[PDB]
């Protein structure tokens, strides 16, 4: 993870994490017993998603306010598998549109 973030972009580093999580449900399901699958999926969240998460989150303005609609929600995925990763892309969100509210409705006579 740590090495994802510094060489992909915010785009790619979705691409790749989703396709790993995938590539761990796969590893764990052809070596381990169940009752092991949830923690390993949940400690690759925590290190590949959580533990970068101010990456994710500094990229998180760029995506949202050119609308790239595929990075959105590949974004949209992977922060709401962590607790605290859906609070500042709805932030931006949340300023994105008041900027756009407010540019829109100042310019009135």
Not at 17 to 33: M, P, S
Not at 35 to 61: G, N, P, W
Request: with cysteine; glycine share 2%.
């Amino acid at each position: 993870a740590s090495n994802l973030l510094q060489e992909s972009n915010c785009s790619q580093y979705m691409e790749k994490v989703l396709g790993r999580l995938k590539d761990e449900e796969i590893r764990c399901r052809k070596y381990l017993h169940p009752s092991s699958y949830t923690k390993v999926i949940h400690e690759c969240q925590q290190r590949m998603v959580a533990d970068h998460l101010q990456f994710l989150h500094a990229e998180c303005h760029n995506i949202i306010r050119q609308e790239k609609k595929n990075d959105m929600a590949n974004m949209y995925v992977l922060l709401r598998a962590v607790s605290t990763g859906l609070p500042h892309m709805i932030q931006e969100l949340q300023n994105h549109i008041h900027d756009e509210g407010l540019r829109a409705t100042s310019n009135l006579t």
